[PDB]
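Standup notes, structure subgroup. Blocker cleared on the 2-acetamido-2-deoxy-beta-D-glucopyranose input:
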Amino acid sequence: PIPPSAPSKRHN
Amino acid sequence: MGSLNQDATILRQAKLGLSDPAQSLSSWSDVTPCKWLGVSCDATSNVVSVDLSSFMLVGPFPSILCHLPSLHSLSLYNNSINGSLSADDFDTCHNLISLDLSENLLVGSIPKSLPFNLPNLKFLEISGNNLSDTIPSSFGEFRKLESLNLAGNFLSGTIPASLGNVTTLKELKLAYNLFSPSQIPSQLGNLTELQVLWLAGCNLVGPIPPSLSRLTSLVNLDLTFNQLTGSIPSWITQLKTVEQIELFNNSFSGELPESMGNMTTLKRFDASMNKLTGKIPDNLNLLNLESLNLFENMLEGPLPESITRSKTLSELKLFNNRLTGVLPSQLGANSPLQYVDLSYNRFSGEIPANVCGEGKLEYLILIDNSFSGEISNNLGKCKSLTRVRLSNNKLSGQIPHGFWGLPRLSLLELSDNSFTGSIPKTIIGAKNLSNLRISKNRFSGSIPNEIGSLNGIIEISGAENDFSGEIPESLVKLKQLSRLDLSKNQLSGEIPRELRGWKNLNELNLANNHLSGEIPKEVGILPVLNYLDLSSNQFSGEIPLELQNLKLNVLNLSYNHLSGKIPPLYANKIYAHDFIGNPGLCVDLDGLCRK
Ligand SMILES: *[C@@H]1O[C@H](CO)[C@@H](O[C@@H]2O[C@H](CO)[C@@H](O[C@@H]3O[C@H](CO)[C@@H](O)[C@H](O[C@H]4O[C@H](CO)[C@@H](O)[C@H](O)[C@@H]4O)[C@@H]3O)[C@H](O)[C@H]2NC(C)=O)[C@H](O)[C@H]1NC(C)=O
Ligand SMILES: *[C@@H]1O[C@H](CO)[C@@H](O[C@@H]2O[C@H](CO)[C@@H](O)[C@H](O)[C@H]2NC(C)=O)[C@H](O)[C@H]1NC(C)=O
Ligand SMILES: *[C@@H]1O[C@H](CO)[C@@H](O[C@@H]2O[C@H](CO)[C@@H](O)[C@H](O)[C@H]2NC(C)=O)[C@H](O)[C@H]1NC(C)=O
Ligand SMILES: *[C@@H]1O[C@H](CO)[C@@H](O[C@@H]2O[C@H](CO)[C@@H](O)[C@H](O)[C@H]2NC(C)=O)[C@H](O)[C@H]1NC(C)=O
Ligand SMILES: *[C@@H]1O[C@H](CO)[C@@H](O)[C@H](O)[C@H]1NC(C)=O
Ligand SMILES: *[C@@H]1O[C@H](CO)[C@@H](O)[C@H](O)[C@H]1NC(C)=O
Ligand SMILES: *[C@@H]1O[C@H](CO)[C@@H](O)[C@H](O)[C@H]1NC(C)=O
Ligand SMILES: [Mg+2]
Ligand SMILES: [Mg+2]
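Run returned:
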């Protein structure tokens, strides 16, 4: 779907 | 009776033009229409609202519903309404206040005539369709619209300047369309009541216009995934009700506005993946802060102590910066820290001992810093942990006993530190363990047999330690094991002969140990083995012919006590480096044997 208006979930 | 009759007929007529394979409208198929599913009436028994959300209805927009004379709200959210919107579809819908067509199958253009036909609307949503062409400039004519959501379509051209005439707007959501590269129209600064501005993934270029400083009621500003440039303007700091600022994945430069510290209302701030320089502002009084993401910038200086005033902080991701200094010693003691990722910085000193003080920490990712000292025994009791990555630091001492057996721990990565001690038998409790990555340390003693009980393990990576004694026979029945690397240790004894449990084993690396006996023949029957390194040991006997079944990226049996002939597949001089240092070995080069 459409990415929510929210924080990036990227991480190591 | 009169109004119940009218409503029932119009509703049934509308339903006839749709397909209802889920039987969602069976109640429309004895009872007054005011009690049919999705239907609300006023006191005179006239239908005022039809909400068919998530009913799996298929077919064209049911414009007959607009013939209900008191219909004010219509939602077809998340169905299969298909085809395109025509001007005509909305001719009779002029009483509507609210229209939700989001998450359907609509294609083609938005009709230019929509504002004329729907002049009373307060709420318009058509998010998540396949709408194409431009947002009509006529949208500037809406006199009452409070919320507009066209996010997630294929709308192109540019955001029309005339939207700035819709000064009743409180929410403007145009995110994830196919606009041409353009600037945020300056005229959006006239929308002085805006609380939500969501223009993520809109191909925006250039600065945030200065006129947007007039949007002093902003609650959520989200301009993520664009190519915006220049400074993050410092007027965001004086927004008295701001809760969320999302600016990640842009080309913002300069520094975080100095007075960010006073944004007491702020819950979420993400300005990751930009080109920010300078320091994290200090004197933070970010009382409501839940999430701070500033990863992938060029930030320098320390994590200020005043971050610990954020008693609701749960997410802190600062990785890939040039941050320095010791962490605030109280970090996590008074916050429900959930996700902490500070990797690829230059932090030093100890890992704050109560980083998991509230028992919520799931990710502790600190790769590539210069953290020193020991892991606190506290962390040994952090039962919520799933992902731990402490590699490439300057950590030392023995690991806390309970750390090895944490019930939800999936990735345990400790490599390239100076940890000492034996792996305890409490490792048996790590039921969810997938990846054990502990290479380049000073771990001693024998690999405990219980690691063979953790059925999910996919990786055991233990190279460059001081492990001794034997490889436990138990490892040989880890069905999911992909990678076994125990090179550069002091292991002795033999490889087990029965290896058919290793159906997923892709890499077997036992180079540079004291291993003896024969290479078992079943090494060659492992179905996905691509890497085999048994070099620098004391393996004897003959190289099994079954190795010729495998397609090996790496085969290294050098520096052992092996004898007999090289298997004929490997007889060419290009493989010779694989077998050097076995004085008992030779190649069958056309008749006799060459050493
Ligand atoms: C950070 O943000 C930048 C932009 O600010 C972002 O770059 C963009 O990523 C998108 C999506 O990954 C890329 O879009 C691609 O476009 C090409 C055509 O040039 C196509 O290969 C793809 O488009 C398809 O779109 C349709 C799907 O609905 C298909 O039906 C159609 O046939 C196409 O194949 C592909 O999506 C592109 O690289 C840019 N786009 C823009 C406008 O900048 C970057 O990825 C972001 N990085 C992170 C880590 O978030
Ligand atoms: C869109 O509607 C579909 C179908 O009604 C929803 O799918 C259902 O989701 C619920 C969970 O709330 C499950 O109990 C059902 O089993 C699902 N059914 C099917 C057929 O998938 C879907 O969740 C809705 N989407 C949104 C975004 O609300
Ligand atoms: C809306 O557009 C999307 C994206 O073009 C279509 O979704 C599918 O897209 C993928 C490739 O992106 C294809 O493999 C599928 O064949 C598409 N689905 C189909 C044809 O059913 C989607 O089709 C479009 N929807 C409509 C109703 O036109
Ligand atoms: C097979 O393994 C041996 C060691 O078990 C490799 O030899 C070592 O190579 C490195 C080069 O990076 C040297 O620093 C070591 O001193 C070497 N050890 C010895 C005993 O010579 C060898 O390179 C590997 N063979 C292949 C073909 O990859
Ligand atoms: C709407 O959907 C149905 C079934 O999926 C299809 O037969 C019908 O022709 C569609 N209409 C249009 C205009 O695509
Ligand atoms: C609407 O916006 C356009 C574009 O900025 C502007 O030229 C026009 O004067 C505005 N006025 C009205 C009444 O919509
Ligand atoms: C924060 O500080 C700046 C000036 O230093 C001020 O303009 C702004 O209004 C302050 N914000 C709040 C929410 O008090
Ligand atoms: Mg401070
Ligand atoms: Mg490792």
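Discussed briefly. The CA atoms of residues 538 and 560 of chain B lie 5 Å apart.
Next: hand off to the docking folks.
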